[PDB]
Amino acid sequence: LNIAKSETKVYTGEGVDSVYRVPIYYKLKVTNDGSKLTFTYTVTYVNPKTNDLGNISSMRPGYSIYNSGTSTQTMLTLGSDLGKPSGVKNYITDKNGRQVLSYNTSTMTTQGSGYTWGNGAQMNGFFAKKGYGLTSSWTVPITGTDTSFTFTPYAARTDRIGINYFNGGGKVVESS
Amino acid sequence: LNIAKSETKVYTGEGVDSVYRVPIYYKLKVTNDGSKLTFTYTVTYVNPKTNDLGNISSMRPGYSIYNSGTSTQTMLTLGSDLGKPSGVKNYITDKNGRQVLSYNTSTMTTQGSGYTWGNGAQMNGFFAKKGYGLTSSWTVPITGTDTSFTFTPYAARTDRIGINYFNGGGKVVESS
Ligand code: NA
Ligand code: NA
Structure with missing residues (x-):
């Protein structure tokens, strides 16, 4: 029948960097191949729609942001037919989503099933x-x-x- | 070694019935037999500590309360080595915790794992x-x-x- 081997959806949204008063953006890419979901989550100051970087010329080079919260701030909730998440790869991507460098892998900890x-x-x-x-x-x-x-x-x-x-x-x- | 065949902990607490301005109480009994946890959850106007019923003489016979909320108000969260909850038995217990009558069994629905x-x-x-x-x-x-x-x-x-x-x-x- 030549059924698709995978299906992918891309979600974007925005918030505000309080310090520099500029938009900050996220992109979440989720790919389903039938055997597993693959999540790719990016936080950036480049607008996903326009591909234009916001004006952060006054951002100091030592300013730093996290893309995740504390161990109690749930970021991902999974349905009953989804198994245990893998380790979380962390890396820096360029404007086109290509890897520049990678940091240490993180570990998923569960807050339990509700x-x-x-x-x-x-x-x-x-x-x-x-x-x-x-x-x-x-x-x-x-x-x-x-x-x-x-x-x-x-x-x-x-x-x-x-x-x-x-x-x-x-x-x-x-x-x- | 004659190790205990089970261990049980009883938790109690209280709140306020807004309508009649009286204390309302809960009791949660949790038994661990090594193979499974058994939960017994009671809501009552009898103080678990004193075994005395609060003054609800003015409570109308048609007044009714639930012991659970909507499908989105999580009441139970389970750790990673706990399996899928059974059906939930619902019943009326007397002052000594003995069953008076039982209603229809409820079904647990998951809100997912966080x-x-x-x-x-x-x-x-x-x-x-x-x-x-x-x-x-x-x-x-x-x-x-x-x-x-x-x-x-x-x-x-x-x-x-x-x-x-x-x-x-x-x-x-x-x-x-
Ligand atoms: Na927990
Ligand atoms: Na859900």
Whole structure:
């Protein structure tokens, strides 16, 4: 049938460098070959649309930027049929996306998999006033040493589900 | 050696029912038997510490509460060596935690696994002014049909990593 061997989508966007008051841009290229996704992520002061570099003539040579945040600032979230990310290659690319030089490879660390459940049950005042409780239970298989988890309690009246009576206070966090 | 066959921890906390201005409580019991974690989650107006029901005599019998939020309000996050959660049993428990009746079982839906990378590389003004870019790349294996993902771009000066130049605007989201 001569089906495509890969499909690639390119996303761009922009923000503002607060220090020099100029636009800063990102480009995210994602390629799907059927076996794996390949991500290529670039931060630059060159507009991807016009290929023109912004006016940063006053930018000092020692000024430096990161393209990633702290270990707790999630940048990538993956669906259930995507496996474990590889190491992250870091490098400097020229105006045409070609590698100028490369730095040390980074390691992906997970913040964990998040879950919720639908068709939530409810407890009425008739039961509540008897001292009854609304209870949910589930099990989670253990496949190795890292059995860490976090749990966020939730309670809300049925006609205003958005207002959490616990408001984020009593979060349960368990290491290692 | 007669090693314990299981270990259990019980977490409690409290919030406020805005409508009736009374404390509302949660209890989370987590049991580890080596093969799986078992979670038991209860929302109630009975104080777990004193075993005393708050004053909700004015609570109308038709008043109802949920113990969970929307499909996007993450309540449980699991570490890398924890597998896929089972179905969630829903039921009403009495003052002593015994089942009074049960409702329909709920289904856990994942919000995905979150990731970040450390040892982030940096680009200096000398390179930026050449029209160069800071680039990271990685691959992700595909094991099924759901290859959805989200990506949040990030850029910050190296002496103030906390201020994201993209501020959350250009988030990349891909279905199904
Ligand atoms: Na964690
Ligand atoms: Na998703």
